[PDB]
Design a protein around this nucleic acid. Sequence first.
DNA 1: CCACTGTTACATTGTAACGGCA
DNA 2: TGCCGTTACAATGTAACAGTGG
Lengths: 50, 50, 72, 135, 134
Amino acid sequence: AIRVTQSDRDLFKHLITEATSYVSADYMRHANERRTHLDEALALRGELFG
Amino acid sequence: EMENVQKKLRKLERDYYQIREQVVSAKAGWCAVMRMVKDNGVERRLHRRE
Amino acid sequence: TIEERVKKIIGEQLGVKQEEVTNNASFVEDLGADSLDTVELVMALEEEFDTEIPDEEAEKITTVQAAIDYIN
Amino acid sequence: MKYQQLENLECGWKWAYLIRKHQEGEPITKYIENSAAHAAVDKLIKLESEPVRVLEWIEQHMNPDLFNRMKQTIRARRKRHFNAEHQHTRKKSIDLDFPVWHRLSALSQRRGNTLSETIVQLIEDAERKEKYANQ
Amino acid sequence: MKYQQLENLECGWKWAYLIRKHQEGEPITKYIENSAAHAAVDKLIKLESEPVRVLEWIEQHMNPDLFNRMKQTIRARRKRHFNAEHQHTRKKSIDLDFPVWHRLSALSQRRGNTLSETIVQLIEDAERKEKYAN
DNA sequence: CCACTGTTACATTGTAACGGCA
DNA sequence: TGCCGTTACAATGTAACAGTGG
Ligand SMILES: *P(=O)(O)OCC(C)(C)[C@@H](O)C(=O)NCCC(=O)NCCS
């Protein structure tokens, strides 16, 4: 029972931590580049109008 | 001469269109993702501000 | 149609429910869209109908009814 | 170096390339003996979930022919994967009839520019005519 | 009907296509139970070198949803096979940067022409402009 | 020099959508 | 309608050229 429960706990911990690490990194990236692209686009729009 | 200038204007217009479409697509994808993570995995687990 | 393409754009650019987005639903208070969110909503509205809007006349739009009124 | 090299991605690409080549029937192995080739392929198959060891399997049993094609294919795949992020960096594939393509390629080779550049110049002349018509 | 259909060729095409799809993981057969699907796939595998029986195999075990895709794939294969004989009937494939393609497709949709026709007309106009200047 | 990378111009196969025609 | 040609793509693989730095 001890062996099984320890294996289950280790598997859960590793899976959860690695999935969060894999996903949140790219999510934050996409957010940062989205902000940057919006900032870039505003100036072009302003110049274009005049 | 005015048409020569409008050529640069159209170039800038194409650039602005490209940037705007990119930003709009990014925003739409972000909104779709947020609506797909209504399972409550986003509040802190996905949004690791660190 | 335009009057439902507007809802398609608003819902998929703010993520709010189609039921939530009525004609009088204001973006900031009802739909919750803040500064950048409203900016992206107006940009998407521009893209959908391949038109352009003045800065002041665009910022004047702050509701679904106003959005359609300027679109149609 | 313009594109970041990611080891755990390029390794998976390489493994998939090897497996695809094998199942197509080509001799990825450098072994002429059937038994050693089969054993090496089986080990490669076991290496599915361990892309890191795939580099070593390459250095031990990969056919000497395939270095150039390998280094070409993974390079192109990297370029395409990084360009696919944004539309404005993507590429569009189109098909052209032989007479049309012949004329276009002759014109491009005349002007010493790529096909996209020649099309840009051509469409720009047409749009200049349209612009002066509009004014 | 423009291209004559040859059984010993199109049947080999169909066999190769189905084997490729099976190797790719596509469910070739209509049997959800794995045993029947595997048995039918083995029948197909050992069925190589046979048009008159691969056709029957298709009629009897083929997945309903793949019929249209297989039919159009064979159509394209036939057309390409017959067109690849002569240089002038062949087709040249190129890759265009997204902005250039966007503008070209805009023009083509505007004028109702195809990409080949639109580019031909534009090149002819470019030549005409050259002659005008010259 | 040499190797490794980026890019263009193809090929090859597959697919969905139109439109013609029995 | 269902078949049949036809177009416009997408995905991947290669050869060839041009750059870059060790
Ligand atoms: P939100 O509170 O983040 O506000 C965003 C913004 C309204 C300031 C922004 O979208 C914006 O409009 N920036 C440009 C303002 C302007 O009129 N500048 C002149 C042309 S660059």
